[PDB]
Amino acid sequence: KSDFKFSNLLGTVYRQGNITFSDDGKQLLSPVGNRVSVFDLINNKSFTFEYEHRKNIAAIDLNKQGTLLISIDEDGRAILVNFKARNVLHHFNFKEKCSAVKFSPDGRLFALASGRFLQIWKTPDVNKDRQFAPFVRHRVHAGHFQDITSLTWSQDSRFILTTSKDLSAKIWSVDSEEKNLAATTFNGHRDYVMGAFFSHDQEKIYTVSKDGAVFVWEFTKRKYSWRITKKHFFYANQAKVKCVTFHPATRLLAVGFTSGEFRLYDLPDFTLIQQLSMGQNPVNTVSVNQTGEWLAFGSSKLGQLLVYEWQSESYILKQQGHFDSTNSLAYSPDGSRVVTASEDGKIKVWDITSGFCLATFEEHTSSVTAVQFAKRGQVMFSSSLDGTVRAWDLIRYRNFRTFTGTERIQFNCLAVDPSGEVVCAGSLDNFDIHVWSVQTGQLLDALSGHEGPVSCLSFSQENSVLASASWDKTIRIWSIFGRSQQVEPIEVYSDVLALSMRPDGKEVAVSTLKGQISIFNIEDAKQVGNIDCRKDIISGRFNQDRFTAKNSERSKFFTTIHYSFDGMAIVAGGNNNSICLYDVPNEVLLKRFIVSRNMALNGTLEFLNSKMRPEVRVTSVQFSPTANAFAAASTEGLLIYSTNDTILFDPFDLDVDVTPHSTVEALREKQFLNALVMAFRLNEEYLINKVYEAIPIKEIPLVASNIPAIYLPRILKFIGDFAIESQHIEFNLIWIKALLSASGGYINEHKYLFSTAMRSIQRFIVRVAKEVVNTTTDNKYTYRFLVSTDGSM
Amino acid sequence: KNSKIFSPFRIIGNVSNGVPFATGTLGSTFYIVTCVGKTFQIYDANTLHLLFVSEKETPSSIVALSAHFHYVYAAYENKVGIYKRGIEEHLLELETDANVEHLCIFGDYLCASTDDNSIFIYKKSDPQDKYPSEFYTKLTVTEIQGGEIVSLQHLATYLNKLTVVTKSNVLLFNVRTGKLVFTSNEFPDQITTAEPAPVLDIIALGTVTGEVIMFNMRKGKRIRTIKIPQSRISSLSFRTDGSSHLSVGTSSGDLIFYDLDRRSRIHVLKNIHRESYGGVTQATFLNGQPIIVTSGGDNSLKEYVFDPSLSQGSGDVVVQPPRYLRSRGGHSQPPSYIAFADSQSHFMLSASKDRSLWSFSLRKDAQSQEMSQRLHKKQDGGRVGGSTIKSKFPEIVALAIENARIGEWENIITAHKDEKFARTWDMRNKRVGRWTFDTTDDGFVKSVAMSQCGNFGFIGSSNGSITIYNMQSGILRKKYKLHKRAVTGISLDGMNRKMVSCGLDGIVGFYDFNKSTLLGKLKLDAPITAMVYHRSSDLFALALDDLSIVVIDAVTQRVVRQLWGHSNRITAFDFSPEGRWIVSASLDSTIRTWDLPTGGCIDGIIVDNVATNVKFSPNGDLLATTHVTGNGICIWTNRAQFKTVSTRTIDELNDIDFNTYTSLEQIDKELLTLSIGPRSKMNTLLHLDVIRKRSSHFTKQLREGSQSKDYSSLLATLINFSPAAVDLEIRSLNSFEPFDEIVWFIDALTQGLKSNKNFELYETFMSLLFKAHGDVIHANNKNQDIASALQNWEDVHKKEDRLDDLVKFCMGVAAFVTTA
Amino acid sequence: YKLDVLSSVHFVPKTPTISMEDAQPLYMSNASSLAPQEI
Amino acid sequence: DFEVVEEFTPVVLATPIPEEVQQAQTEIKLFNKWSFEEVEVKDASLVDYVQVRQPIFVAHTAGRYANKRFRKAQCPIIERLTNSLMMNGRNNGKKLKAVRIIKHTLDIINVLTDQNPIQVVVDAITNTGPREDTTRVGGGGAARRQAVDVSPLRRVNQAIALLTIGAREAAFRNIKTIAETLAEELINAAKGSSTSYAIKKKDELERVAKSNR
Amino acid sequence: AVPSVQTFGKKKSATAVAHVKAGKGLIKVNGSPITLVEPEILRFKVYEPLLLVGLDKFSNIDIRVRVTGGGHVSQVYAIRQAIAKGLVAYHQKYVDEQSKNELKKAFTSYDRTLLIADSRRPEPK
RNA sequence: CAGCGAAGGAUUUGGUGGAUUACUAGCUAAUAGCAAUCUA
């Protein structure tokens, strides 16, 4: 239950730093703020590393074995991570701002540009155990006079070519015996040298500067001593070079400027292969694939990330995120994608597994305040500060409906019908609730009776009663449908922000400004029970303010709460860097999550070092409708916390004779039901999978009819989280058919237990199985046409 | 015994052990290299930060260590190791079996004295290299010439000579010619220390009766004598900043300061270190500086500074006494209890037999701080009792930290040796708290716990009664009386709903906590000594008296595992943070790891000291053990955080031993099965034209499969290559005169989807065929070969409606069951 | 932009062939996403 | 065995509190006399409409029960009896007089039938409420009645109404008062004696429904 | 100098100010004890803040209530509201928060009108 | 007054030291030198 771990970070495909590819360039590693995201672009998936720098990261490299990563932040706190185990190996503090870090091509050394010293360390093994000091220093060279801007290793890991703000570039041999081969310095640029590369044969050296000159250096005679043979110029007048890279094998120089324009050249002849623009913001990063076919560009101001193949002129992806400006989120009615309403005025529909945005919608001319799904993922409603609620078909991607009032107000929250006839929206300057029909477009009603700004709205999903709650310290329940026009006001102790509604519509949980979460019975309007949450809230100290984090009244309350789908838990977040979840029977804190440890954000540290910034805040929390997770719209992105059953041995009434050995003996002796319930009492995912695949098709329905009723949600949620990605489609559908036929009355009379295990199953039937069935159906009908009709002339 | 889960990382909390440290000087800064057992540690003397720790543990204890500029020379059992930045550069094996026990380094020479009164000289090869490396000669101090060698020094401007300080004599060797230049007259008492003065050719000798001699090593006389009666002299140091002071260090822990110019005694720092642990073991002035670094055997390293004089004209006669400056320290006695302060594995609380509670940092050793015992004020306003001569609290039996409400109120609850109340502490302030919870039955505190709401603390007395206090306000809330003998374990649920107590009468009581009922009581077969509650999985483990570990869950109150194998009393145990393993340690000098899923012993370590405490980190990072000897905390890292270990039992289905199940490729040949690959490949193939608008071997294998009537290699190549390659191979298939390549592709897809594997890909390959050149198939429809190939493709493909009505049933009934 | 950035609490940030069209919706490989009534 | 200590000093206050008042902190009884546990509703379909599961100290809960439809199904049935007792033009508003005569009638119910008077009044409700009734199917005014069933809230409503107005007319000009006539009415309705106005009226309504069923 | 706490209890036009401080255990309404609060049939309406939570909460504190306005039943409802939320506020400020929200849970399970009145009315239908 | 109460108790304040981010040493013209010195 409560054992959530940080899974993913949706939104924000790039923040600051350098993009890296893999060696077999399938994944790309992107520095999001202090995490690192890794997007696998072929197997369409994505993860974010769990570890966390304390400032924004500025350098990334992983060796070409793929086996370990090193990430340096913007004051030199390096972190060495095991890339396969996903666990951090060492924390090493270089003392000043490191501009670049690079592993050697042979993997065994890495070097980095810390200030004006090039320092080469040698890589610790991944097979060795963790030591107190795993890095052993090779050397530290100081020949530059100002800060080094770039490294480049040679093809053999033998020379290293560094570029500085000082107007030179230098070549250093790795070992001392080749010191005479590499002792030259390369002058002649008017500005900062942005890059210095070898050719494929390491005979020519190209040095690209900030003003726009690329110099070709050759070991010629005018003795032989590294002349400059040709200077080529970009002649981009106002713009200047922001990032350079070179693929030496395909002779491809890729250059991004401070105007969004990037050009890519075939270098020793200097012929413009292509020139095109990311946008208007500067191109902060260029990176290239190992085969040189993909170019990943990152612009840091809008947080955007291209990877673009330059042969077939086409963008593998275009993915722009939102730093700090995200007002709301909503899970799709199957937990496959999250819709994000963001303050720059747009809707963005992010896939969860593959961490990318599918569609974006810009028809609001101001900050979109709320999104909400309806009609089972077919329609999606959003309300913004420009005065409009509007509806979005997620099939034809059209804004088909726009609802305004008559009073020119700005809407801050909405709520739709279950049977989506009516949308409803509340403002923070009008004290009314606006009730629109969705079929026609008209303003059906204006509900009046709050004496304070309507902070939150929610329709009960079962009996369709409206619950609004406002800053006049009052939650209010409106019976709209069918001749009632009934109003029931429940007073509460302080002013309310974030009401939420149970999945059965029985109760409503409100968050108040005191710091509490009160839970009320709707039909008999009396309080069922409250949680006192203002003492398990982490409220950090800002830098500008002159009052301690203990005595602050800034963020000791929750501005967004949400029920779990079994109705038993509440996740909650606010303008603080803790999100807390509770179980509402016992009113006790299950777990508290620190949403950021970035010291670049403001409200993170409670105690500031006695030796504006974007504050950290969560603006919306939601539980996943299909699989045991929650998304939180922080300032860093959409933090996705999820459990997984691979770890955490948590049995269910095992005894001493219940053992993996006992389970495989029962499987080998083919008591299949006993093996299945032994694996359920182990609650071990590999054992459940092993027994599940070992049961034959002949006796799926006998086992599925004899499964005990306490192990029913376990086998249903297992079949869901297995069958989304497993290939055994007919096996999984046979099991689903046998379970629904044998025990599908228990499910119907215990709806909210199997409310997230059944939504995960019909995330498998309509999303892989129905697509396959559509393909075979179209093949059958094209066959019947192509052989049944007359093609003659 | 080497392990396969945990590997040794460091032993934290150690600063010194009373080997005389060495000082070294890089440029104008100073470092201080102190021995901690078998490693040394380099400290930055301007701030006492831990720069370096030696990379490997030496095979025995380091016994004499010196430091020139970049290099540190550490002598242990037989040999001298030359270390730079911790990493060992060289190892000088001596040709003896005698233990090397002194050394000096001057010039190209390293001179190492053994304990059989032989001296080994080692020489550099060429005077430009970094350390003395080659053997040169051997010197011997026989019984005629002098006693046991008590020090080995080189006083300056002495061209390749060596002052050897024996117990009665002072010899002077020429170490190039191997000669004994000068042997002094005898000394009437045994001399223990020596230090060269910054005066030219003067050494200072310290005797076992109380006198400092100032021997002039060129005249052969003694210049002056300083008498400190009944004090054995253990250190000598000289001030070198224009103030001629000497600092002697006395093995009753005293540091006495003398003016040599005006022959007075400046000041005495009394009890600067403990006499019982050796007194002041090494004291030295950082040269040119008024700061002196002392170190003692009580695991402590201090600095004292001389402020400038307070009289603006006299100065030299009004010498302000030395004051204290920074210091590092740890426990002076081996720790008795261990806990982790937080889930981040950053701080760990640690209580010792020297009656101190330290908070040690696993990230940076400067952050280690002693929790203060300065009591608060009484709540009403009455007087607090106790002695006026303040001493530390009795040594800590148990403790329990739960930082849910940290900074808010009292946070740690701790139980001391043979006293009837449990103190509280605040980890945020790092100090004691306002409350001492009584037991209310005149019994000593045998266990403590506290809930994870942070509101409640639980005291378990030796007369069998649990008392539940409030941590905020410090008052009795409830009191359960089930046991009659001593309650050794209390814990509570993560939801404050069921508590579990275990006493040494061998009954585990299960109580409801909100209601004050008991849910049950289970009688085991031995007295229970210790409980550990794994709180997420609700499984608690008991160390019984019959040397078993009973793992029992609190939900259904059954013994669910029973782990046998320990040969003596189980000292400690702890759960893995995921709750899969349990690591125990017992008085047969062993540490075992048990995989309680399978119920067997994964790994065992025979460790020479008995491990008295074992704690996992609250993440899966580290194991922390605590042994009988050694003032620190031994730290291990689990290698199973980076690899996966086999849960296969030691003594003295490889996927099921490695907890995996690689899902088999297809379960039955009559079952449809998708590809082992991404699900999106079907959609990419079916719509890659509009996707991009929004953004040969094949022919030879096809022909050879048409010969052999087996297209398995063709279909393997098709399932292998990429969507652009698939479209570009299907789009070029010779659709013109006899139509062979089309019909070979069609009955290849027939042979493919007869096999019920990759069938969504075979379906999209047929869709791509009909899309690319289904117009030529429609054109020469009624052609015999292509019509028969499509006929048998439909013959196999018409058995695909099993999937259709299967997903129709699942969709319709799932919708009906969910909605209605 | 500038009047509502100073009238607020929380922080608000601010020829070749193509500007790559980084922001673009409608795409789960949809081509004819029009309505049948629209057609 | 096992015992919990949860007070650690005998509680004494500076204001002296009566011994039965400080005995009332272990169980809530109506008027500190009549226990609410082991008071069951011996007829199902009326449990969840006669409410005896939140015990009270006096029949004067000033809560608001007339602003949703079935919210008066969880007013405690002693207070519903009290509120129905304070109705006519003479005795409107006088809830303290109604509470005082409810206290007197429960005292004399217990002194006549030595059993729990809350159990007696709950049995009187569940025996009085009619289980069938007739509506007048109109046809423009064709005088024909059709038997309908009757919902449990209407059964509890009409039960309290029949009992209270039977006590009024039984106390109309006899020597007995409203408290004594209501006691006789609740006792006879509890045992179901057919000597009460209330269950004679129930038997007439049910018999007419049986007639023109 | 003393830890003290002031709360308010209101019904229609009665209003009651309750001062709670540490003491010996005396509960006094309008100077007279709590066992004199007429109309004597609603004395248990006044008592139920004491009997719902036990007199061991009141064994260490002394309350005084000053009640003006209203009528008989409005004054007993003001008294019980003032006593209840005064005990809650005292255990908030000077005793632990766990006993604070245990008291809030007990009073709210009995009736939350001990803690929150029904104040602004009517409804214009 | 009672009570609390070990060769005393309370309040206030100045200075210094250690933490307030996760520990790979100083200098320079830096593949090494110096640190007693870079200069003939």
Side-chain angles (χ1 to χ4, degrees), chain B residues 699 702-707 711 714 733-734 739-750 785 789:
Chain B
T699 77
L702 185 44
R703 201 174 34 81
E704 288 176 352
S706 162
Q707 315 301 331
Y711 302 94
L714 181 80
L733 266 195
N734 289 337
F739 290 83
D740 300 71
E741 206 168 346
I742 282 185
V743 308
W744 295 341
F745 194 62
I746 292 173
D747 53 18
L749 299 194
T750 295
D785 221 355

mmCIF file of all heavy atoms in Angstrom, chain B residues 699 702-707 711 714 733-734 739-750 785 789:
data_model
loop_
_atom_site.group_PDB
_atom_site.id
_atom_site.type_symbol
_atom_site.label_atom_id
_atom_site.label_comp_id
_atom_site.label_asym_id
_atom_site.label_seq_id
_atom_site.Cartn_x
_atom_site.Cartn_y
_atom_site.Cartn_z
ATOM 1 N N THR B 699 15.720 -11.002 -50.629
ATOM 2 C CA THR B 699 15.267 -11.697 -51.829
ATOM 3 C C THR B 699 15.949 -13.046 -51.973
ATOM 4 O O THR B 699 15.323 -14.016 -52.413
ATOM 5 C CB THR B 699 15.526 -10.846 -53.059
ATOM 6 O OG1 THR B 699 16.913 -10.920 -53.393
ATOM 7 C CG2 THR B 699 15.162 -9.401 -52.778
ATOM 8 N N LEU B 702 14.262 -15.301 -49.457
ATOM 9 C CA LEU B 702 12.918 -15.610 -49.917
ATOM 10 C C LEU B 702 12.947 -16.671 -51.004
ATOM 11 O O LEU B 702 12.134 -17.602 -50.993
ATOM 12 C CB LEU B 702 12.246 -14.336 -50.421
ATOM 13 C CG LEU B 702 10.787 -14.371 -50.855
ATOM 14 C CD1 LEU B 702 9.983 -15.159 -49.887
ATOM 15 C CD2 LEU B 702 10.276 -12.970 -50.911
ATOM 16 N N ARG B 703 13.906 -16.571 -51.922
ATOM 17 C CA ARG B 703 14.038 -17.583 -52.959
ATOM 18 C C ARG B 703 14.455 -18.926 -52.375
ATOM 19 O O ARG B 703 13.878 -19.957 -52.730
ATOM 20 C CB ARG B 703 15.038 -17.110 -54.003
ATOM 21 C CG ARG B 703 14.916 -17.781 -55.345
ATOM 22 C CD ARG B 703 15.861 -17.145 -56.351
ATOM 23 N NE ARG B 703 17.113 -16.698 -55.744
ATOM 24 C CZ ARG B 703 18.144 -17.492 -55.469
ATOM 25 N NH1 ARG B 703 18.080 -18.789 -55.732
ATOM 26 N NH2 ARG B 703 19.235 -16.992 -54.918
ATOM 27 N N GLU B 704 15.429 -18.929 -51.458
ATOM 28 C CA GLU B 704 15.881 -20.173 -50.838
ATOM 29 C C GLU B 704 14.796 -20.821 -49.994
ATOM 30 O O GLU B 704 14.706 -22.053 -49.938
ATOM 31 C CB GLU B 704 17.105 -19.915 -49.971
ATOM 32 C CG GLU B 704 18.365 -19.631 -50.739
ATOM 33 C CD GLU B 704 19.516 -19.283 -49.821
ATOM 34 O OE1 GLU B 704 19.273 -19.128 -48.607
ATOM 35 O OE2 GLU B 704 20.657 -19.169 -50.306
ATOM 36 N N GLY B 705 13.960 -20.022 -49.341
ATOM 37 C CA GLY B 705 12.817 -20.584 -48.661
ATOM 38 C C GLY B 705 11.772 -21.097 -49.621
ATOM 39 O O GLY B 705 11.039 -22.028 -49.294
ATOM 40 N N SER B 706 11.687 -20.513 -50.816
ATOM 41 C CA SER B 706 10.770 -21.070 -51.801
ATOM 42 C C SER B 706 11.275 -22.390 -52.349
ATOM 43 O O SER B 706 10.477 -23.230 -52.772
ATOM 44 C CB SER B 706 10.551 -20.093 -52.945
ATOM 45 O OG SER B 706 10.023 -20.778 -54.064
ATOM 46 N N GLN B 707 12.594 -22.573 -52.385
ATOM 47 C CA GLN B 707 13.150 -23.880 -52.719
ATOM 48 C C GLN B 707 12.838 -24.891 -51.625
ATOM 49 O O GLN B 707 12.220 -25.930 -51.873
ATOM 50 C CB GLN B 707 14.665 -23.807 -52.921
ATOM 51 C CG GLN B 707 15.213 -22.668 -53.749
ATOM 52 C CD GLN B 707 14.675 -22.613 -55.156
ATOM 53 O OE1 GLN B 707 14.313 -23.630 -55.743
ATOM 54 N NE2 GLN B 707 14.654 -21.419 -55.724
ATOM 55 N N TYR B 711 10.338 -21.097 -44.611
ATOM 56 C CA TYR B 711 10.660 -19.678 -44.598
ATOM 57 C C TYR B 711 11.018 -19.178 -43.212
ATOM 58 O O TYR B 711 10.787 -18.006 -42.908
ATOM 59 C CB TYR B 711 9.492 -18.869 -45.138
ATOM 60 C CG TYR B 711 9.055 -19.209 -46.526
ATOM 61 C CD1 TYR B 711 8.042 -20.118 -46.739
ATOM 62 C CD2 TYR B 711 9.611 -18.577 -47.622
ATOM 63 C CE1 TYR B 711 7.615 -20.416 -48.002
ATOM 64 C CE2 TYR B 711 9.191 -18.868 -48.895
ATOM 65 C CZ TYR B 711 8.192 -19.790 -49.076
ATOM 66 O OH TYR B 711 7.757 -20.095 -50.339
ATOM 67 N N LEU B 714 13.614 -16.460 -43.383
ATOM 68 C CA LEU B 714 12.996 -15.265 -43.945
ATOM 69 C C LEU B 714 12.205 -14.515 -42.892
ATOM 70 O O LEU B 714 12.357 -13.299 -42.725
ATOM 71 C CB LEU B 714 12.065 -15.641 -45.082
ATOM 72 C CG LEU B 714 11.477 -14.368 -45.654
ATOM 73 C CD1 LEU B 714 12.480 -13.729 -46.567
ATOM 74 C CD2 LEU B 714 10.168 -14.597 -46.300
ATOM 75 N N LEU B 733 8.874 -5.918 -54.631
ATOM 76 C CA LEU B 733 8.664 -7.357 -54.566
ATOM 77 C C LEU B 733 8.315 -8.000 -55.903
ATOM 78 O O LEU B 733 7.646 -9.035 -55.898
ATOM 79 C CB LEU B 733 7.546 -7.703 -53.582
ATOM 80 C CG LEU B 733 7.857 -8.052 -52.132
ATOM 81 C CD1 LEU B 733 6.650 -8.696 -51.503
ATOM 82 C CD2 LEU B 733 9.051 -8.951 -52.017
ATOM 83 N N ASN B 734 8.728 -7.416 -57.032
ATOM 84 C CA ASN B 734 8.588 -7.989 -58.378
ATOM 85 C C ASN B 734 7.133 -8.341 -58.701
ATOM 86 O O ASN B 734 6.731 -9.501 -58.754
ATOM 87 C CB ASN B 734 9.495 -9.209 -58.567
ATOM 88 C CG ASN B 734 10.958 -8.835 -58.648
ATOM 89 O OD1 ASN B 734 11.297 -7.701 -58.983
ATOM 90 N ND2 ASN B 734 11.834 -9.793 -58.371
ATOM 91 N N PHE B 739 4.765 -13.218 -61.155
ATOM 92 C CA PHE B 739 4.332 -13.054 -59.767
ATOM 93 C C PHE B 739 4.821 -14.192 -58.880
ATOM 94 O O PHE B 739 4.034 -14.939 -58.305
ATOM 95 C CB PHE B 739 2.818 -12.895 -59.682
ATOM 96 C CG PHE B 739 2.340 -11.613 -60.229
ATOM 97 C CD1 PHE B 739 2.145 -11.458 -61.582
ATOM 98 C CD2 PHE B 739 2.131 -10.534 -59.401
ATOM 99 C CE1 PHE B 739 1.733 -10.264 -62.095
ATOM 100 C CE2 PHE B 739 1.709 -9.332 -59.912
ATOM 101 C CZ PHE B 739 1.508 -9.203 -61.263
ATOM 102 N N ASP B 740 6.140 -14.329 -58.775
ATOM 103 C CA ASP B 740 6.662 -15.346 -57.878
ATOM 104 C C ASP B 740 6.975 -14.782 -56.511
ATOM 105 O O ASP B 740 6.712 -15.432 -55.502
ATOM 106 C CB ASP B 740 7.915 -15.998 -58.445
ATOM 107 C CG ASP B 740 7.666 -16.672 -59.751
ATOM 108 O OD1 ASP B 740 7.469 -15.948 -60.731
ATOM 109 O OD2 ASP B 740 7.649 -17.916 -59.800
ATOM 110 N N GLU B 741 7.550 -13.591 -56.454
ATOM 111 C CA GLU B 741 8.030 -13.076 -55.186
ATOM 112 C C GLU B 741 6.885 -12.664 -54.277
ATOM 113 O O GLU B 741 6.973 -12.858 -53.059
ATOM 114 C CB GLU B 741 8.983 -11.920 -55.452
ATOM 115 C CG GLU B 741 9.996 -11.670 -54.383
ATOM 116 C CD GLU B 741 11.077 -10.725 -54.843
ATOM 117 O OE1 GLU B 741 11.167 -10.482 -56.059
ATOM 118 O OE2 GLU B 741 11.836 -10.220 -53.991
ATOM 119 N N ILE B 742 5.787 -12.178 -54.860
ATOM 120 C CA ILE B 742 4.575 -11.896 -54.092
ATOM 121 C C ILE B 742 4.016 -13.176 -53.484
ATOM 122 O O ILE B 742 3.715 -13.223 -52.287
ATOM 123 C CB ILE B 742 3.525 -11.201 -54.977
ATOM 124 C CG1 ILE B 742 3.853 -9.727 -55.174
ATOM 125 C CG2 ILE B 742 2.146 -11.310 -54.365
ATOM 126 C CD1 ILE B 742 2.791 -8.981 -55.935
ATOM 127 N N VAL B 743 3.902 -14.242 -54.281
ATOM 128 C CA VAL B 743 3.264 -15.446 -53.756
ATOM 129 C C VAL B 743 4.192 -16.175 -52.796
ATOM 130 O O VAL B 743 3.725 -16.847 -51.869
ATOM 131 C CB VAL B 743 2.770 -16.368 -54.887
ATOM 132 C CG1 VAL B 743 1.935 -15.603 -55.844
ATOM 133 C CG2 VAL B 743 3.886 -17.050 -55.618
ATOM 134 N N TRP B 744 5.508 -16.002 -52.948
ATOM 135 C CA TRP B 744 6.427 -16.560 -51.972
ATOM 136 C C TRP B 744 6.324 -15.814 -50.657
ATOM 137 O O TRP B 744 6.382 -16.427 -49.588
ATOM 138 C CB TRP B 744 7.856 -16.510 -52.487
ATOM 139 C CG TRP B 744 8.131 -17.344 -53.655
ATOM 140 C CD1 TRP B 744 7.400 -18.386 -54.104
ATOM 141 C CD2 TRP B 744 9.213 -17.183 -54.566
ATOM 142 N NE1 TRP B 744 7.966 -18.903 -55.237
ATOM 143 C CE2 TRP B 744 9.083 -18.173 -55.542
ATOM 144 C CE3 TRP B 744 10.286 -16.295 -54.648
ATOM 145 C CZ2 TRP B 744 9.986 -18.308 -56.584
ATOM 146 C CZ3 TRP B 744 11.174 -16.425 -55.679
ATOM 147 C CH2 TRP B 744 11.021 -17.421 -56.636
ATOM 148 N N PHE B 745 6.134 -14.496 -50.716
ATOM 149 C CA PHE B 745 5.913 -13.743 -49.490
ATOM 150 C C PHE B 745 4.601 -14.132 -48.829
ATOM 151 O O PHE B 745 4.531 -14.231 -47.602
ATOM 152 C CB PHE B 745 5.928 -12.255 -49.782
ATOM 153 C CG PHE B 745 6.034 -11.415 -48.564
ATOM 154 C CD1 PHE B 745 7.140 -11.498 -47.757
ATOM 155 C CD2 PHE B 745 5.029 -10.542 -48.223
ATOM 156 C CE1 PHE B 745 7.241 -10.730 -46.641
ATOM 157 C CE2 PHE B 745 5.135 -9.770 -47.103
ATOM 158 C CZ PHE B 745 6.243 -9.867 -46.316
ATOM 159 N N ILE B 746 3.566 -14.395 -49.623
ATOM 160 C CA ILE B 746 2.263 -14.708 -49.050
ATOM 161 C C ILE B 746 2.277 -16.073 -48.379
ATOM 162 O O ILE B 746 1.804 -16.219 -47.245
ATOM 163 C CB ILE B 746 1.161 -14.607 -50.116
ATOM 164 C CG1 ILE B 746 0.990 -13.165 -50.538
ATOM 165 C CG2 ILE B 746 -0.150 -15.055 -49.559
ATOM 166 C CD1 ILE B 746 0.072 -12.981 -51.690
ATOM 167 N N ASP B 747 2.857 -17.089 -49.021
ATOM 168 C CA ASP B 747 2.864 -18.349 -48.287
ATOM 169 C C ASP B 747 3.980 -18.420 -47.247
ATOM 170 O O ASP B 747 3.914 -19.271 -46.354
ATOM 171 C CB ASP B 747 2.862 -19.556 -49.238
ATOM 172 C CG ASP B 747 3.949 -19.525 -50.265
ATOM 173 O OD1 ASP B 747 4.928 -18.795 -50.101
ATOM 174 O OD2 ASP B 747 3.809 -20.242 -51.274
ATOM 175 N N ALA B 748 4.927 -17.482 -47.264
ATOM 176 C CA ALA B 748 5.807 -17.304 -46.115
ATOM 177 C C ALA B 748 5.052 -16.755 -44.916
ATOM 178 O O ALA B 748 5.275 -17.198 -43.786
ATOM 179 C CB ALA B 748 6.947 -16.368 -46.471
ATOM 180 N N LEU B 749 4.173 -15.774 -45.136
ATOM 181 C CA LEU B 749 3.330 -15.286 -44.050
ATOM 182 C C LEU B 749 2.342 -16.344 -43.587
ATOM 183 O O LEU B 749 1.952 -16.351 -42.416
ATOM 184 C CB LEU B 749 2.565 -14.039 -44.472
ATOM 185 C CG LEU B 749 3.308 -12.783 -44.895
ATOM 186 C CD1 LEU B 749 2.353 -11.639 -44.909
ATOM 187 C CD2 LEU B 749 4.456 -12.504 -43.960
ATOM 188 N N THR B 750 1.912 -17.223 -44.494
ATOM 189 C CA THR B 750 1.081 -18.359 -44.106
ATOM 190 C C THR B 750 1.831 -19.292 -43.167
ATOM 191 O O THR B 750 1.314 -19.671 -42.109
ATOM 192 C CB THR B 750 0.630 -19.113 -45.347
ATOM 193 O OG1 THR B 750 -0.219 -18.276 -46.133
ATOM 194 C CG2 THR B 750 -0.122 -20.357 -44.973
ATOM 195 N N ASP B 785 -1.782 -19.327 -59.197
ATOM 196 C CA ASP B 785 -0.804 -19.375 -58.119
ATOM 197 C C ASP B 785 -1.121 -18.353 -57.036
ATOM 198 O O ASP B 785 -1.114 -18.682 -55.843
ATOM 199 C CB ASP B 785 0.594 -19.144 -58.681
ATOM 200 C CG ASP B 785 1.626 -20.048 -58.052
ATOM 201 O OD1 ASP B 785 1.270 -20.787 -57.113
ATOM 202 O OD2 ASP B 785 2.791 -20.024 -58.497
ATOM 203 N N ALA B 789 -2.399 -19.113 -53.210
ATOM 204 C CA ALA B 789 -1.645 -18.593 -52.074
ATOM 205 C C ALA B 789 -2.534 -17.776 -51.148
ATOM 206 O O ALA B 789 -2.475 -17.935 -49.921
ATOM 207 C CB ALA B 789 -0.471 -17.754 -52.561
#
